[PDB]
Design a protein around this ligand. Sequence first.
Ligand SMILES: [Mg+2]
Ligand SMILES: [Zn+2]
Ligand SMILES: [Zn+2]
Lengths: 1154, 198, 120, 76, 49, 298
Amino acid sequence: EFDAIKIALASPDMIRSWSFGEVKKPETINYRTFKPERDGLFCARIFGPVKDYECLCGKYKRLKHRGVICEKCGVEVTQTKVRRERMGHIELASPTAHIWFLKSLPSRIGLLLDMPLRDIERVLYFESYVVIEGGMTNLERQQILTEEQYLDALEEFGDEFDAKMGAEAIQALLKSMDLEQECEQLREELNETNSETKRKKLTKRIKLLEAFVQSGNKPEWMILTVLPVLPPDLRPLVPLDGGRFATSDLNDLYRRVINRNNRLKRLLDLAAPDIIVRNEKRMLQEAVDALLDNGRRGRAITGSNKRPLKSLADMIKGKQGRFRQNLLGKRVDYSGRSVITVGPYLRLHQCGLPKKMALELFKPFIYGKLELRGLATTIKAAKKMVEREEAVVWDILDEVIREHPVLLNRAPTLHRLGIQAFEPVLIEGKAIQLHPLVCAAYNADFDGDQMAVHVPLTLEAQLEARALMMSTNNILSPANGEPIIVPSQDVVLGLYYMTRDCVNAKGEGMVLTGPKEAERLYRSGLASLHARVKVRITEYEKDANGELVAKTSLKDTTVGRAILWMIVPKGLPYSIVNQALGKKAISKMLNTCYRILGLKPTVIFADQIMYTGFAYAARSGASVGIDDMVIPEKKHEIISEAEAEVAEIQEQFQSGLVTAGERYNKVIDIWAAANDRVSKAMMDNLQTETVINRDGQEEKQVSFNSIYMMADSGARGSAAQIRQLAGMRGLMAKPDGSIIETPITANFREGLNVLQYFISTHGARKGLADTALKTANSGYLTRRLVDVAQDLVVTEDDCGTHEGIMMTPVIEGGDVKEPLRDRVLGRVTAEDVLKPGTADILVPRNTLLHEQWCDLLEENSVDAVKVRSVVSCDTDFGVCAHCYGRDLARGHIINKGEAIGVIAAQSIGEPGTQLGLPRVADLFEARRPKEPAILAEISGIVSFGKETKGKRRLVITPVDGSDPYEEMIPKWRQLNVFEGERVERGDVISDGPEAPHDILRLRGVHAVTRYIVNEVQDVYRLQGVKINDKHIEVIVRQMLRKATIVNAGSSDFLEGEQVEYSRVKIANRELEANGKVGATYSRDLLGITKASLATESFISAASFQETTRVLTEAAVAGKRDELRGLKENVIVGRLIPAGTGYAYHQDRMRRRAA
Amino acid sequence: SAAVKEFFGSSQLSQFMDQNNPLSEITHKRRISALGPGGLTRERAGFEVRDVHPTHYGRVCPIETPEGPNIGLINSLSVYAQTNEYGFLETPYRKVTDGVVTDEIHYLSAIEEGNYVIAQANSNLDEEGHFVEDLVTCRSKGESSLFSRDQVDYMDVSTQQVVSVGASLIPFLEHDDANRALMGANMQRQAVPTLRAD
Amino acid sequence: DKIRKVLKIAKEPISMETPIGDDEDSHLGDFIEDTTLELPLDSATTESLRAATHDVLAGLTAREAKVLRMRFGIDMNTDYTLEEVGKQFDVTRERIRQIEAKALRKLRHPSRSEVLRSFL
Amino acid sequence: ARVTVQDAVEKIGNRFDLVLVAARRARQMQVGGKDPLVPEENDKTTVIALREIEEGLINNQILDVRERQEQQEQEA
Amino acid sequence: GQNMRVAFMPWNGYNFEDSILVSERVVQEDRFTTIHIQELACVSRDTKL
Amino acid sequence: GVLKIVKVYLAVKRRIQPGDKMAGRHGNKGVISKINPIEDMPYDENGTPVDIVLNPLGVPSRMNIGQILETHLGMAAKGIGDKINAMLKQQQEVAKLREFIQRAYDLGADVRQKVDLSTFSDEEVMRLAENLRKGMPIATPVFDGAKEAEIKELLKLGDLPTSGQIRLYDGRTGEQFERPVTVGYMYMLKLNHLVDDKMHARSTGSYSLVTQQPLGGKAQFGGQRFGEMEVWALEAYGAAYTLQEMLTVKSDDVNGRTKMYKNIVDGNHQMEPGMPESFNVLLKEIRSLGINIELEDE
DNA sequence: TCAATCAATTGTTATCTAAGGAAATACTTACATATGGTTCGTGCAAACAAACGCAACGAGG
DNA sequence: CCTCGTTGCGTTTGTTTGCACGAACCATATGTAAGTATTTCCTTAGATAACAATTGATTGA
Ligand SMILES: [Mg+2]
Ligand SMILES: [Zn+2]
Ligand SMILES: [Zn+2]
């Protein structure tokens, strides 16, 4: 229907064209019969009827008379919905400046006229005069007088003198100026001037003038002579119960404007003295400012209460404005919410939905089925049946939801898996039942959490829920490739308990005919669940494609592992169940099943694992008692020895040998040593102390202590918590940071005394407050990341670029922090990868490195592999699928259309609460460090020049090239290199943290992307989080989206114009058809906030950050937003160009370019 | 009348009484808030004001506080805490002579608490007022240490005096992590009266 | 009684941006519904009633059905009067009155208006 | 019955064209203009369309060919 | 509240993350039953019609 | 204006169900998931089922050990009552009840509390015993509580094991659970978070005034906010029709939602999305400033 | 001996997601006159409503 | 086939509705005050960080 959205200035003629009449009075309602007043803010003639097809007076109350205007009242008869579209206008008796274009900082009115905003505000508030082409004899045009000077020149000059006051003077200046001649003169000044501050001012002024004269805008339109009026239904005056009315603040602001305008008209009619008229014009200006913004004028005007009135601008900007509260998110029909319970019987693809919830959510479907199956004659009858809940309504409801998925969503949707589709199974209750394996994805527990259910209505939405969002399709993380439906705590405990072996167990040694014999032996009580036995077992191997060769062998295992082996699918080795099966083992086993067998066997295996683990954790009778927290017998000895050392060192301090701080540090060290000793003794006493005998003297086996088994299996707890339970809970640091010299020696099995508990609360509250105040900034970071990368989609299949990045294992300090396998898994090689000896082509050029190629590389010990990256792709407006890689949510290459920018933002952002995080915020904002690194700007020989107060001028001279670049380096910066040396480009001269801008400028795009990915990955790795580098590289590519034209040459650009890099790329592509190019650029690097705010679309940039600035710039420049983005289409309610709508959008282009 | 009604009806510090419990009522009535007209705001309070202070000992509960936007701003009064004539919280202590723990109670304010060394409630007495141990654990100025029997001026009146009424209804509190004790007190403020009180 | 009217006279309207006790994001305007809206069930019922009247008037003699469609504004312009219908049928007004009474009687038959009475 | 769509995604690919083609075909069945091509098992038209895709009986190419031939035979 | 005979054990995933498994005797004895009086006001006003 | 007010007071009775939040005093939250038949519950040698089953994995990660202690002592307390109960079911004597109750109040360590039953008249001792037949209340002050050895001694006074764990049997199968489990008495609370007051659904209802969108939660029968992050999740999927219907026909398109309701009524699950009304409001609001914003290529 | 370039001050903009809670209350011009709108009861013609009489029709005999 | 019961049509008598029309009673809008009288308040708190612009001092030419 509409292709783009155009924004520009509004002329008085345009504002009148919108208008359907002039709001002449401030009246709204008649206070006795509440009908609208004749020419007021709620007027039937101007804005339309208040009842459907009913004339206000009462002479026309039928649809038949539609299309006529009455005579006793002059009210058109039509629908009432037109009240939401009809606008009015107010004819101001005095021009008033638009506050946005006067108080934008920079002020468009001030910059256009080259007049300081101070002078303009002085003239506007009738404090000083301004000459207006007032004769080219004694006073210049832009000169400003005062009362003294104006009166002086009055008798001295009658004619050829024009000095006016207020906004009429500003309008006269803005209308008398001609843009082309001013642009020409300023171009001459710019070309014949050498000063960077004045140069920059001239560039800014020229850009405003050119973007103004190119568009249809006229400067005088920045002074409002006609004021548009919002439709009444958008500023309602509705009745509240009890004879009270609820009104919008816009009514009050408009009433003030109308009152003051009418008073000004009256005063000018009376020919009142200039002082009174000037005061009234000041008041009218203030009223218009308040209506538009209710700020930028010192004091906002408050209403009947003491709260400032909400202005026209306040209803668009902010977290509560239209853009973010009603256009990017919404309240939605066909939705419910309830508490979540567990329901461990469910299959992975289904959820328990309460019958009443389903009955309410599917009401139209039920009405349709009732009518179709003949059980209700009319829709009202079907409604009555559904209200009465007759027996057959439930049968209809069962038929309706048979294969209708529903979307389950938990409140903080940190990533994709926060919404998942499930098949409903109707439950006689009121709490939604959630499969235990999706709780980790939801980050959901069952201590009072709630979930929202949404019904997909159309066939497309239902098929999308089934084929994209179904919980069975989402079993791998989209951040890393790791599985996300791994069994969590009770399942892990059950499998761990059933798989580990005892030393002398009932039924040990006997030889079994298979897993069925093992299960029969255990369930009949003749053998212990974990008794070391031999058993005939039949593995299946899928060496080649398809064929599953069977290998039967006598394995030495336990009864429990043999029992578990029946759950495993065919093409998996038996060794996966011949270990103790902790949390890590089960996750690796599910990953192996997915990578060998596929998706369906993995889903079945996950369900069976959950069922078996629950069953055997139940049978285990695992419990927690006070005896299960065993304290080391040496704890008393250790604390006594540490206290004796403390007393000794305290005496030494009292002997005048060591300062109090050093004594405190020594005490801290010895107490930490004692804490480590206690913890080690506790773990030794609790992990393997269990001693028993097998037909002999004695043996040793791992402990069956319940707490220990929970910690070791990975079900719940960790060595830190276990030591806090049995051993001392270490030293406490007061929230300042100082470690309390006296450490808490009591654990929790024994009590904490009052002092220790007070000290513990010191840090407990600090942690709670920190986590309460952390997710805010992490959410802000995720919002910025999503806004920068929202318009990134896999548009092509292969760009054909050869450029890539070299991935090597990260080593720091002689140890590997992350191997090459996990860095190069799923990325397409950019250039052919040879063996270290150059023997032959190990892997072809453009192969997607799955785990087989990665295994080959590991076997042949290849250290560096050059793989394609999103940051080096050649695709315009998107990226090919071969530069992205594997689509870590699936195993196959990324599909065409996937919104990889949103996925990258969510993957980077959802772990931010585990974080530190301000370091990542700094990296993505590309902030320059406080004391940066002075890198070598150019290659050459270095020398020193003047070294006076104007700090040392360093000169680097190339062998042949010119060397006008000299750096003003401080003396208090320690030079890394000597005075008489030679330095290469992008080298280090001083010492300090390297700013990302300088890394990009001197070393390159690969250098800066490597810097960013390595630093942020260092943060996340330190904190234990796993994120693929695809996502960080996506964010970096979005940060590198602009370029400055160092030499326009024969292109159609300026010099300092910061163009979008894709535009200059296509321009340099096209100009290769010709001969002349002369177009050279320097890539810029902006922060995510700065990169996303400086984007082609003005709607997507106004929608998230400061809206006044973006809207004013787009209005003065006359920007035209072709949607071509996810945010833009989400706002206008169209199919986003990302997923199943991508094709649709492409088709639209097919029809648009014809 | 308008001023009085505006205060008592529509003001931040006058709120609907939590009435789903005896404990909820009692712990609402003795509730301290740093917000309201004349105090901070939950949006821009700052961590330092939210944090537990060593002067909170015996005057403001360390754990009974809401977790969320206003944590450390809605503290609750401790069991024995009082208020000066001037409005400063004071807590009781039993006076210690040379070595005898007398039964006379002095209410010490926060600024007066530093100037003496105060023994702990978990300190022993040999049936006549004298400390069994010659070195007793005390707190003088923010920190705690060991002091000679003939050094202390005051002793804690009871071992319950650091907690609020709700926190002091948790058996085996000393065995519970401070986060979970905070949660437990907050939760037992919300228990619904059942058909028969057991 | 004038005293009661003067006291009832509406006080100053409440701002629709009035915070609710939470004072965070709940404003008065968040609790006010559009009273002049057609519920989807009502609109669907209107459509079904139009269809039912069509399918019921279909089962009437030609002139009786036309008379009934004219006397009420059934899928046409303003309703006609009996005199106008005579002006178009060229018959006496009382004749059209009798015709419409008989048509309504026939439409009152059971097994002919059970769905129509279900519409009540 | 339906649990996962991996054979239909395999047979069509792109995981997005599958949704569009399945929606086209399910709407064809839903409106009284077409009949299932696989034995109905009490399934909804969406699942029936997916099961037809898995069998290979429905593609985006098959659907447009059938639409074209229906148009051509409409001339009669 | 009520003092209840509690056992600490997994029991089949019906107390998985923090879920609680309750016996029917607890419901039969109505020992976690509560009474919830509530007001509902019908106000008749003076409308224009 | 108001002529007459009639207030009706209703008295509901909320029993218990899955979804209701329970809690102990030690920060151990929990939502009821299943209500079990009495013959499915674990039971001990005497055939007495446990009322509640709590996950032991909740305890170690969050160091709230008090509950475990509270359980042990709880058992001990009930144990004393059980003994008293027996001595009251058979009319043993005043002397035996007095002796056992007196022994139960002494319990070893030097506690500041003294109870002398000698001053209790026979009639008063019987009243005390009748009040103690449901269990013996025990006070465990905040930081001056009951030591673990005292808990074991009280467990010994009753005939309960001092380990705090008994062997339990599966009601489903009658098989003995391995690895004895911790059973006792814990004080559970019913929190004011009833699933009766929290379940909520909506197909269509009232709509907001300026923006033609559903309203708030469960008091205006309003819908669920499909906020911006949910939109991001839909965008990360390919779900473009889901997203479009979510933000056009389910929320804001005035003409679209009525057509969708009708189309669903006759089993045609197709939508005519249209332009959401809130974007129209935004256009009229930007135009109400002196800014001309329009749609191109009409 | 002026002005291009640092440096401190001022002003603008930003700070997680959902569910519950309902809003309040000071702050007084009066007496007279012209006019005009609104409410109310009426009349007149039009528009329905009842109950027949006559004639045509079409079934019965 | 003749004759008698049912229906189409017009007629006569009787009743409710739709407009238009005074009449009167209150509602609104507007005017007129002649000891003097002469520049306002009031409000509000314990953020924090980042980023530009603007204004002021230092320094290269
Ligand atoms: Mg929770
Ligand atoms: Zn009219
Ligand atoms: Zn590429």
